[PDB]
Structure formats: C-alpha cells, structure tokens
Amino acid sequence: CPDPVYTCRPGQTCARGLHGYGC
C-alpha cells in the first residue's frame, strides 16, 4: 500500500498495527 505502514498485497486490504503482525 501507499501508506507508510506495512505494505499489503494489492488484492487484499492493508491494515495498520495488527497484534504486532504485518502483511
């Protein structure tokens, strides 16, 4: 994702701060 947070797949959504887990 464009956001500064962890980048997630294109098809899948990207979330920020998830139980200390990234994409």
Automatic annotation (TrEMBL):
Cystine residue pairs: C1-C14, C8-C23
Full protein: residues contained: 30 to 52 of 102
Record family assignment: Belongs to the granulin family.
Localization of this protein: Secreted
Name the UniProt record assigns to this protein: Granulin
